[PDB]
C-alpha cells in the first residue's frame, strides 16, 4: 500500500496460527517445568 491506503490499515488485527507440520520429530525427553493452574488466577472483580 501507499500512504493514502495505509490509513485504513492502522489498528487492524492480524492473527497468526501454526501447526507442527510433518516429519517433525522431538528427540530428547526433558521433564516439565513448574506449571501454573489457570482457574486459580484471580477474577476481574468490580
Amino acid at each position: 500500500a501507499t500512504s493514502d491506503d495505509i490509513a485504513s490499515i492502522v489498528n487492524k488485527p492480524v492473527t497468526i496460527y501454526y501447526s507442527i507440520g510433518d516429519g517433525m520429530q522431538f528427540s530428547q525427553w526433558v521433564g516439565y517445568q513448574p506449571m501454573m493452574i489457570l482457574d486459580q488466577l484471580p477474577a476481574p472483580v468490580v
Binding site: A7, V10, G23, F26, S27, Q28, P34, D39, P42
Partner: protein, 393 residues
Amino acid sequence: NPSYQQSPRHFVPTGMHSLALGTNLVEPLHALRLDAAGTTQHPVGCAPDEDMTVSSIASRYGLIRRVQWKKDHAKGSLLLQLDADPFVEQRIEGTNPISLYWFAPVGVVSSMFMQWRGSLEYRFDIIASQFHTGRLIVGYVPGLTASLQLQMDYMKLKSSSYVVFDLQESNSFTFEVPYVSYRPWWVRKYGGNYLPSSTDAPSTLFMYVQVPLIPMEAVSDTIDINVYVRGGSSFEVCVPVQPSLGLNWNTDFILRYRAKTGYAPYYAGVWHSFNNSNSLVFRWGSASDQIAQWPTISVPRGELAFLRIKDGKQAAVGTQPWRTMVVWPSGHGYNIGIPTYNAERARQLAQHLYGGGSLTDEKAKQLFVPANQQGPGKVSNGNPVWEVMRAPL
C-alpha cells in the same frame, strides 16, 4: 479448437481448510521450498528416538511426594491422603502472587485432555536400611465426597481394597490403583479458568501406619518415603480441550481511566469539527475523523471530573507534555479528549461544562489549547492511565 458446450460444476466456496482436523487428510499449502516433491529428512544419526506418544509420556515416573515417617507416629497415624487422579500437586513455596506447582508427566499430559480413564501406578520408595522394620497400608476407597474426606481411619480403609506392605529387606513397592466409576471416562479436575467446571477425584488413596516403626539404636528414627506417579498400562486419555496448565516462562498476570481500546497511541492535533481546527484534541491517526474516543466518567449531579495523567513521561507531547484534559461529548456520538495547559485550566473547563456550558461557548474556547501549540504532535506511550480528578461543583 472444438467448443465445450456441456454444463459445468456448481460448488460452495469456503475461505479456510480444516483448522482442527489433522490425521487423515492432505492439507494443501503454499510451501516456501524450491522442490514441490521435497520433504524434510533425518539422516542418519539425527533420527528420532522418542515417538510423540501419550502412552510413552504417561509411562514415566514423576516424583510428586515426600513423606516423613517417624518413630513416634502412633499405630494408625495418617501419612498421606491424596486423590486418585493424574492431577496431584506439589506446591512451591515461592513469593509470587500466583503459585507454581510440580506435576507428574501423566498429569501434565492429562491436563491437555478432557477425559481420562485407566489404572494409575504409585511407586513408594521407602528410604530405610535393612535394620528398620515397619508395616503400612496403602489403601484405596471408591468414591468419596468432600464431607467423607474426614471420618477416616485405618479401620474404615480395610473395608475397601487395600495392600499391607512389610519393610524388612526390600525397600520399594508399586501399588496399582483400580479404576472404579459410574462413567467409562472421567472429566478432568480443572477447567480452562471456568470455575463452574471443577470436578474432584473418582476415588481417594490413603496411606496409614499399620505397625509403627521399630528402629535400632544405631540408625535414625525418621524415614523418608518418596511417592512417584505414572499412568499405568491401562491409562488413556481422549478428548483434547484447552489445557488447564500454563508454563512458567512468563509468570506475569494482569488484573483488569484511559482511551477506549484501539484509540491509542494518540497525539494532540486539530479537527475541523472541534472549534474549526483552531484547538487541540486527541487523535489516533492523521486521516479523516480519526479522533480518539474516551469512556464516560460516572459523575453525579453536584460534582465535576477531569483527568490528570499518572505518569507524565507517557503523555502525548506538543510544546509540552499534555498531562491534563477534559473529556466531553463531541456532538458526533462519542467523547473527545481536550488537553489543557495545566490542572487549573482543566478544572475551570470542567466547571464550565458540567456547570451547563457548551464547547462552542467563548468561555470554553478560551480554555482550550490553541492549534499553534501542536508542535511535533508526538503520540502517547501506548494507552496510559489517567487519574480521575473529582471535585464538588
